[PDB]
Design a protein around this ligand. Sequence first.
Ligand code: PMP
Ligand code: PMP
Ligand code: NA
Ligand code: NA
Ligand code: NA
Ligand code: NA
Lengths: 278, 278
Amino acid sequence: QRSVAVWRDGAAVTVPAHQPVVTAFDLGLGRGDGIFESVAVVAGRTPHLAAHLTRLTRSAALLGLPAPGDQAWMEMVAAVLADWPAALEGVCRLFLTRGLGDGTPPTALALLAPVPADTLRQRAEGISVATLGLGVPADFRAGAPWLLGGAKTLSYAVNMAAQRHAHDLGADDVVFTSLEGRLLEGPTSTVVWAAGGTLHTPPVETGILPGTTQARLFTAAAADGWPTSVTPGTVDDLHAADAVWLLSGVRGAAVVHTVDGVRRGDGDLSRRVRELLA
Amino acid sequence: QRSVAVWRDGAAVTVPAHQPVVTAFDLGLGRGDGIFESVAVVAGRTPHLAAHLTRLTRSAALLGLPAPGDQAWMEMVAAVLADWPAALEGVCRLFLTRGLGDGTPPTALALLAPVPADTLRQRAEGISVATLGLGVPADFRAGAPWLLGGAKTLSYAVNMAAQRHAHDLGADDVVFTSLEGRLLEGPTSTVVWAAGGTLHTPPVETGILPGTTQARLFTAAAADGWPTSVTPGTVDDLHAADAVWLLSGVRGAAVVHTVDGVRRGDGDLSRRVRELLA
Ligand SMILES: Cc1ncc(COP(=O)(O)O)c(CN)c1O
Ligand SMILES: Cc1ncc(COP(=O)(O)O)c(CN)c1O
Ligand code: NA
Ligand code: NA
Ligand code: NA
Ligand code: NA
């Protein structure tokens, strides 16, 4: 079902999943002032844990958050995995909040639940997306560190609101665009498209999250002799592409069959992408 | 010290302030997916509670959050006020989160703590501000409801990050600006300035929060024969003004004596503003 472990006096303490763990005054709750990582649990193991802990360190640095370090997080992951069924794919989230303030200790915990059946169905059968503007110029966040570009924060209200807006239009998910129409990323995923025999993704300098699933695909692609590129694409690139995916550590590769109500095929390229991500 | 009440089976239940109240899976914590209000407690009373509950309803509507209604919130405010010292000014926050998801009940609670001594000192002695761009055009959010303009959400990571960036420059607080340099609002406050015998504030259509302290000042000003205006001002207006304040329900009227390192007087206008807010 569900498993939680909290960082308590330099140790991981298992607590029941329904038991409250955060007080009213925690800044992760009241201000969305914290960071997180979402780690896949597959056959009772965390195949990409280290990639996620490296990015956790970077997120914590951007928010000036003291981080308990890799050892602590592996102890918390171990605690929630203890009784986890290998046959049940899980999502293990790591939360690090400012706690009661800068000066008091940050709050660390791990929470593990099943990947929902609808998320597995999106991986199997793919998705529709709506393009929604963020209204920020593509070049703006590189000059505005207070906007927390490239950090994976607890402040995802907009990310969730964009998804519900999409759902209201009849789409599964979103691709965000800059003011000038440049592709950014999904609310919870990285955009990749195939065009001219090359795998493409938008540049990180635009203030998006550097996706671990997209990075591992590109590394694997390179080795398999599939050319890759960082490309400042637009919605035009998505319509024109041979294939479009949203990639994330939990959902995986979700082929985008529909962009703003415009149906699209994948050129039977999804299979090699899935093989490379395996 | 601190007081908390949680909405439990249609009643306000007092819990100790140090006691955890939110589980790991609460979307207010993991996604910053909720709304809040901050209510002043002055001589053991909530002088502007109704103004805050009206805006709570509007915030909840924008996020598609079922809200427990005014009666419930007054019961929760009553529960935390019960043993509160009248001599100690407080901040009573009301949190409404999506809870475990849309379909399961939203999480409601009230949390009361003292207004910190440094916040009272800012009210007494005023503040320095840094202007920081949001990089969104002034007209953009009115067309992009997924950006949650005009909603007061738990997703304030950027709001807090801007303040720490200001603190690093040697400023107390921030005024956000649009892409074209239009004044928006503070991370936690409303900008007002005095110019040509008129009290000015930026337009709400820019996607800012409609401030209850600024609204009550303007109503009072009107009655006292101080002209008021909604004005699409820029940073130039702040430098040029006779006086600049940041207004909020907790800090109150904080005279801004410094804008981007440029010291400024208030034309001895603060006293009439404070009298009108009394
Ligand atoms: C905003 C955002 N962008 C991209 C991603 C994809 O990253 P990953 O492939 O590491 O899961 C995520 C999920 N962490 C995300 O939340
Ligand atoms: C973003 C923002 N803007 C403005 C304000 C000022 O509103 P109020 O005067 O109602 O406290 C607040 C404080 N609620 C705020 O958080
Ligand atoms: Na997903
Ligand atoms: Na796959
Ligand atoms: Na304040
Ligand atoms: Na005053």
